[model samples]
Target: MMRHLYVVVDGSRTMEDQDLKPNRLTCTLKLLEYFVEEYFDQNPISQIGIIVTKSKRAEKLTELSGNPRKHITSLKKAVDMTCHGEPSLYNSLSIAMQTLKHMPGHTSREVLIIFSSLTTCDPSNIYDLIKTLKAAKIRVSVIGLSAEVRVCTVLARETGGTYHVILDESHYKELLTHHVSPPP
Candidate 1:
């Protein structure tokens, strides 16, 4: 079956830290090149969209499409840009949900979040949004660079997705590559 995947990347200043070597953002982008290619290779018909959270806002950098080249081009352009300010998980998820909910019934709607922030500045209670996601059958998985946050744990748990914190660069790459496979 085909899938609709929304990839939410954290662009907060915290990602600038060198904990992951070079930095979280740099390492993530590098891994993404391989990840994106592997994803399309495994799921040729699946569509993907990229969203970036920065400066307390979420912006869609690429629309959902089965074309891998488009997504790769957009990911490459991100390296030239600077990431700053706090990340708004709520905003990013909301933006992703808006489109994912409308995908065809046959397509599995899933979200893969690469988060570095230890906290989220939400405009409203996040639990309510999580509930909505569950009702829509959207699975949300999170890969955190820092220690686990309660909200992220709940978000993944409630949506029947997995939440993992990266121990190192190798660990991060492994977790990300895991998402390339279709959800069982």
Candidate 2:
């Protein structure tokens, strides 16, 4: 079965913190190129999208597509995407739904949020939004750069997805590698 996955990256200023080598976002960007390669190689028929949360909004870095080149280059451009404002998990969550919404029923709808901030500054109530995502059959996973967030854990649990906080850059990438391909 084909899958449509969205890897939502964190672009908050906190990502600029130098805990993970060069920083959180840079480490993630490097790892993402490799993840895109592994993903396309294993699931050639499946498509993936890239979304980044910055400036208090969730924007599409790359539209849903099957090409590794397209996705990686988009990932590369993300280097200068300008990390600003606080991240809104719910806002990014909502943005991802609209993209996944248009996808056909036969394909799997999945979202992976590479989150760094411990706080979420949503414009509206997000708990209800979680129910909506669950009802929509979208599995939402979150990999955190900091400590565990209740909202992230709740979102993951409600959607039948996994939530993990990294011990370091390597551990973070290890979790990412799992999402590169569908379950065996």
**Candidate number with greatest lDDT:** 1
On residues 1-184, what C-alpha lDDT tens digit does candidate 1 reach at each position? 7778888888887776777767688888888878888888898888888899988889999998888888999988998668877888999888987887777766578888888845787788888998888888878888888788888988889999989987778887788778887886
> What's each prediction's TM-score?
0.95, 0.94
In candidate 1, list every pair of residues with a backbone clash. Answer: none
lDDT tens readout by residue for model 2, 10-34: 8888777887867678888888887
* lDDT (C-alpha) at residue 159 in model 2: 87
Off by over 4 Å in 2: none
lDDT (C-alpha) at residue 35 in model 2? 82
Candidate 1 achieves a global lDDT of: 0.83
User: Model 1, 114: alpha-carbon shift in Å?
Assistant: 0.6
TM-score of 2: 0.94
CA lDDT of every candidate: 0.83, 0.81
